[PDB]
Amino acid sequence: VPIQKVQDDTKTLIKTIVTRINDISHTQSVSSKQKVTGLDFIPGLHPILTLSKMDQTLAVYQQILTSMPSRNVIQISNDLENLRDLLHVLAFSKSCHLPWASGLETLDSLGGVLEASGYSTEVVALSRLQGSLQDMLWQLDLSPGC
């Protein structure tokens, strides 16, 4: 496993997902940092300094994207899976043992927000994902640690 290629690949997966979200016109107009009530459980922009938190973030994002019926987001879910697996292999190349993050045990609540107000949930979740990805790419040179 080439180490240099994996960091560059990490960059590439992040940029691809960011562009995917860019294609989604409604998400672009929505403020990433801005707080919307009810969605607080989704891990939005809060400093993601280390590998275990980023991994759990991607796990939660995977759980959110799976539940919402949209074609673009699903293949994107595919991109997120490759990104997570890539993060695990990089964590291995640094001699770190990353336990496979489970998603949130507390999903019995996310269903409610999706039924009552779908629009807020999708636009917020995607825009915060885009923000988180930018921070991920930013931090990927800082020599991330486990």
Partner: protein, 596 residues
């Protein structure tokens, strides 16, 4: 004792009132009076209320958010000493914190719509001054639109609405009511659908059926929408202002490959006014598109004029066009005639005829002997109608239309030893070109004129060469062209005279090759008492047995450019003949290009 009321349901009205409803038991053939017991359990106050109602429903004003409604109903015979039923099973309905009124609005483009909202924060109703509205989470709505109806409730008013543009799956625009900077997940749905649907109809040329079409393109955005054309038939003609009628009937319409719906009216009432509109039966509500009235007689597409004939009038030379008016309509019609030279692309000239009793028109044409394509179409003379399709092209047949305009240009070869009084003169001409022949030349006739034998004529048929014996002192010859109408109007003559053959007026003659395609021949004239009409230049190769080439040139000309293949190595003879009324003069001849 009636059975307890069944099917106890609770719905929220667009006004935000709680409508409790139930069904009467199906087995009572008499009206029931109901007693409704309900409790409203909020976090701070319990209210119980018993209401007696004769209707199968009750409104409870202003549903309180974050409250629990328990409901029971019992029935009794309305008339007489009826026994009460037992109570219905209690039904609980738990409400949400945030109220929009209305929750949804279905409108058309250009309308005005307004919403009211209440925002609950920890079991408290916030002041309206705090409430701010947002659109699609993208941007804040301008403050000017907001209106404070009361301290608790805020309202937004929209004017001159534009069609909602769909973003992905969502057909509607999400409107939010927020407490300052922070918003909540729940939003209001705004559905604006373009009801401006164009329905166009066309009556067939036989007035046997009526065809109507309309497009789906504005409505492909709403899944679950069903579309039904409705129509109302008037007894006579269309009203000045079309309107939706309460009594309407549906029409079976079929989606075509081009994406348009087709509605067929068969058999037809020629003078009945058909009012049409589209019924959009959304899951919540019915919307009617603007109604339009169509008169089948005013939307008739007539058949093209039949039996179109194009002939050029003999002797006159006009393109005479005729046709038969299509059966419908029998009302006065105007006609449009396009005509042009037949080819791969026809340059159509237009002509319009507004005389109702007109069946044929005559139009001057520049070439009488070409095939013209001609198509005709018709429309109601008053303009109230559509244009018919263009008729199937008619083509002219080339026929002679006048006698030939001009007789052929001819020259002579003289075969004769200088010692004989008699010489064979072979006249030679080319067939007339289309402009001079017009259409055809059937035969050539040679008119001879002499001092002794007078005038006679010899029929040469379709031959382009003729040889006669020249014996007399003066012999004038004229070649006529004859077609089925007669002989050519303007004919060339040539007088052969023996005294005059000594007269020489061409002082010098020179020929200079400009290139392999052009030689200048120039000459100088001496003064002459005879009135020269024109020259003929004759040239031939002397190295080949080439045909003697010749050309007629005006007497006003002193220099000519002969365009022919001239080989500078070969010896060409150039003969310039001066031509006078008394006949062809003595030629000046040169046998070489002038090298000087």
């Amino acid at each position: 004792k009636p059975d307890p009321p069944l099917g106890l349901h609770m719905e929220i009205t667009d006004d935000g009132n709680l409508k409790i409803s139930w069904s009467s038991p199906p087995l009572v053939p008499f009206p029931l009076q109901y007693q409704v017991k309900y409790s409203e359990n909020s976090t701070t106050v319990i209210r119980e209320a018993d209401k007696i109602v004769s209707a199968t429903s009750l409104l409870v004003d202003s549903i309180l958010p974050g409250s629990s409604y328990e409901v029971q109903v019992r029935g009794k015979r309305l008339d007489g000493p009826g026994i009460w039923s037992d109570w219905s099973t209690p039904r609980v309905f738990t409400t949400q914190d945030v109220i929009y009124f209305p929750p949804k609005i279905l409108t058309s483009v250009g309308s005005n719509v307004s919403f009211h909202c209440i925002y609950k924060k920890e079991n408290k109703i916030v002041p309206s001054k705090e409430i701010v509205w947002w659109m699609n989470l993208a941007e804040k709505i301008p403050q000017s639109q907001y209106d404070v109806v009361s301290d608790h409730v805020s309202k937004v008013t929209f004017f001159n609405l534009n069609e909602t543009k769909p973003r992905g799956k969502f057909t509607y625009d999400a409107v939010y009511c927020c407490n300052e900077h922070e918003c909540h997940h729940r939003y209001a749905e705004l559905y604006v659908i373009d009801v401006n649907i164009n329905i166009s109809c066309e009556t067939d040329g036989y007035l046997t059926k009526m065809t109507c079409r309309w497009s789906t393109s504005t409505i492909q955005s709403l899944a679950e929408s069903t579309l039904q054309l409705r129509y109302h038939r008037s007894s006579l003609y269309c009203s000045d202002i079309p309107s939706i009628h309460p009594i309407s009937e549906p029409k079976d319409c079929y989606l075509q490959s081009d994406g348009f719906y087709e509605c067929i009216f068969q058999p037809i009432f020629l003078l009945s006014g058909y009012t049409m509109w589209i019924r959009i039966n959304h899951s919540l509500g019915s919307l009617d598109s603007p109604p339009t009235c169509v008169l089948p007689d005013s939307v008739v597409k007539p058949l093209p004029p039949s039996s179109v004939k194009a002939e050029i009038t003999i002797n006159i030379g006009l393109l005479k066009i005729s046709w038969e008016k299509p059966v419908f309509p029998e009302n006065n019609l105007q006609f449009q005639i396009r005509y042009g030279l037949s080819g791969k692309e026809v340059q159509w000239k237009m002509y319009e005829v507004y005389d109702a009793k007109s069946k044929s028109v005559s139009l001057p044409v520049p070439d009488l002997c070409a095939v013209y394509a001609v198509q005709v179409r018709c429309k109601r003379l008053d303009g109230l109608g559509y244009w018919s399709n263009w008729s199937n092209p008619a083509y002219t047949v080339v026929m002679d239309i006048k006698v030939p305009m001009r007789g052929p240009e001819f020259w002579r070869i003289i075969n004769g030893d200088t010692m004989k009084k008699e010489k064979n003169v072979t006249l030679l001409w080319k067939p007339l070109m289309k402009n001079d022949s017009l259409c055809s030349v059937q035969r050539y006739v040679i008119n001879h004129h002499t001092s002794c034998n007078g005038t006679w004529s010899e029929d040469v048929g379709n031959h382009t060469k003729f040889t006669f014996l020249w014996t007399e002192q003066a012999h004038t010859v004229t070649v006529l062209a004859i077609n089925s109408i007669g002989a050519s109007v303007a004919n060339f003559n040539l007088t052969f005279s023996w005294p005059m053959s000594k007269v020489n007026i061409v002082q010098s003659l020179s020929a200079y090759p400009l290139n392999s395609s052009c030689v200048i021949v120039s000459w100088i004239l001496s003064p002459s008492d005879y009135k020269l009409m024109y020259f003929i230049i004759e040239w031939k190769n002397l190295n080949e047995d080439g045909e003697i080439k010749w050309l007629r040139i005006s007497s006003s000309v002193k220099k000519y450019y002969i365009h022919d293949h001239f080989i500078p190595i070969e010896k060409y003879q150039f003969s310039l003949y001066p031509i006078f009324m008394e006949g062809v003069g003595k030629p000046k001849i040169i046998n070489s290009f002038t090298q000087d």
